[PDB]
Amino acid sequence: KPDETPMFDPSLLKEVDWSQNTATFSPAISPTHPGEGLVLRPLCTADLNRGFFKVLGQLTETGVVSPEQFMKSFEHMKKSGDYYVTVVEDVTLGQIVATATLIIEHKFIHSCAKRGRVEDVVVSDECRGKQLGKLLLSTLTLLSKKLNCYKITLECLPQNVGFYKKFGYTVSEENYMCRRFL
Amino acid sequence: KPDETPMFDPSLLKEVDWSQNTATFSPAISPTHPGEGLVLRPLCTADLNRGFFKVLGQLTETGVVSPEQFMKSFEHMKKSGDYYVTVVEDVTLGQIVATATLIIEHKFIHSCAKRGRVEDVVVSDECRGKQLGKLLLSTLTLLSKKLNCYKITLECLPQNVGFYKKFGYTVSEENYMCRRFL
Numbered sequence: 400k401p402d403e404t405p406m407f408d409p410s411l412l413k414e415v416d417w418s419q420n421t422a423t424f425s426p427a428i429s430p431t432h433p434g435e436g437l438v439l440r441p442l443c444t445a446d447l448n449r450g451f452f453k454v455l456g457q458l459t460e461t462g463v464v465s466p467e468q469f470m471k472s473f474e475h476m477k478k479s480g481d482y483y484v485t486v487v488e489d490v491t492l493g494q495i496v497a498t499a500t501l502i503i504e505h506k507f508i509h510s511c512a513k514r515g516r517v518e519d520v521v522v523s524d525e526c527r528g529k530q531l532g533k534l535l536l537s538t539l540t541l542l543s544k545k546l547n548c549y550k551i552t553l554e555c556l557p558q559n560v561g562f563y564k565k566f567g568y569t570v571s572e573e574n575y576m577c578r579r580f581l
Numbered sequence: 582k583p584d585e586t587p588m589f590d591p592s593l594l595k596e597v598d599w600s601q602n603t604a605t606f607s608p609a610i611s612p613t614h615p616g617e618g619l620v621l622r623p624l625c626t627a628d629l630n631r632g633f634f635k636v637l638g639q640l641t642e643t644g645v646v647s648p649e650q651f652m653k654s655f656e657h658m659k660k661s662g663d664y665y666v667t668v669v670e671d672v673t674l675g676q677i678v679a680t681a682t683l684i685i686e687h688k689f690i691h692s693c694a695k696r697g698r699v700e701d702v703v704v705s706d707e708c709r710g711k712q713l714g715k716l717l718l719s720t721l722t723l724l725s726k727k728l729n730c731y732k733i734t735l736e737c738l739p740q741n742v743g744f745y746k747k748f749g750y751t752v753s754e755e756n757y758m759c760r761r762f763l
């Protein structure tokens with residue numbers, strides 16, 4: 400039952416106004432031309448057998464996941480309309496090489512506005528030098544703007560701030576706080 | 582058509598294990614006994630006529646909101662299962678006096694785990710001294726733990742860190758970054 404149906408409408412990524420990109424690419428790549436033998440598209444359940452968790456596990460721990468577990472989560476994300484899990488496939492190898500999620504959050508403030516979040520971004524190690532993290536960040540940042548978000552946020556270590564400033568992000572005055580449940 | 586149907590199941594707030602509360606209350610209040618003539622419950626569309634935006638507008642700007650706008654947003658939040666917009670009503674006055682949102686975010690990492698977020702917390706000014714922000718933070722923090730989140734996060738100004746440490750939050754090493762779209 401893992402199939403090729405995308406989590407969200409793929410034309411949203413073609414429709415992204417790439418003239419609004421501010422990151423430097425050499426060579427020039429775009430969501431429509433992401434690089435030699437690469438496709439930038441929404442996640443589908445079939446990516447479970449294209450090494451999706453192999454990419455993700457490079458960011459943090461993915462643990463033990465059943466197929467039914469993965470598909471239950473995928474379906475909930477699709478149904479909400481709020482999740483934009485975006486992958487890069489090397490179509491020569493039939494393998495995911497990069498992933499990133501845009502989450503939309505609906506509010507009542509600012510005249511019932513929407514905000515974006517960048518989550519779970521990781522590029523497979525053997526793809527260093529393919530500019531995919533840059534492409535994913537720029538694409539998703541511009542996607543949220545396309546989806547009428549008033550702002551988009553993310554978290555990173557101070558050492559990596561410079562990277563995100565290139566897509567228009569600045570350091571907030573607010574502290575990021577967290578509680579991990581035991 | 583604005584009615585009394587809660588955004589989420591209200592028994593979730595009664596079912597919150599309040600023995601796990603770590604905030605200091607004097608007098609002792611709980612989600613079940615939030616204070617004289619107060620009820621702690623999910624938001625319903627009828628709260629539009631109970632001064633919900635009057636409370637919210639004290640946190641930030643709410644702008645101009647149509648009834649149809651408010652109900653479209655409410656319904657999307659209810660449908661996703663991911664939004665826990667929680668209010669305090671003074672039932673003597675028939676008015677909202679406090680609000681806070683728990684957002685659930687579904688991931689694939691950590692064996693398809695869930696994370697919480699605390700958003701849009703505000704207590705009406707005339708309710709200073711009723712311990713409602715403390716009650717809301719503790720309640721929602723414990724609610725996310727109940728809903729099987731592995732962690733919960735929020736953002737605040739450094740000046741306000743001490744307040745949130747009381748519910749188990751610590752300052753992250755990661756910087757909060759933001760882009761506001763023009």
Ligand SMILES: N[C@@H]1[C@@H](O)[C@H](O)[C@@H](COP(=O)(O)O)O[C@@H]1O
Binds near residue numbers: 459460519520553
């Ligand atoms: N910005 C990313 C998050 O999107 C990701 O979820 C997190 C994983 O870390 P953890 O495994 O501690 O939740 O790392 C970074 O902070």
Ligand SMILES: N[C@@H]1[C@@H](O)[C@H](O)[C@@H](COP(=O)(O)O)O[C@@H]1O
Binds near residue numbers: 573699737
């Ligand atoms: N933690 C709260 C957020 O939950 C809220 O959404 C924000 C509103 O600020 P703005 O109006 O700049 O989005 O204020 C704080 O940062």
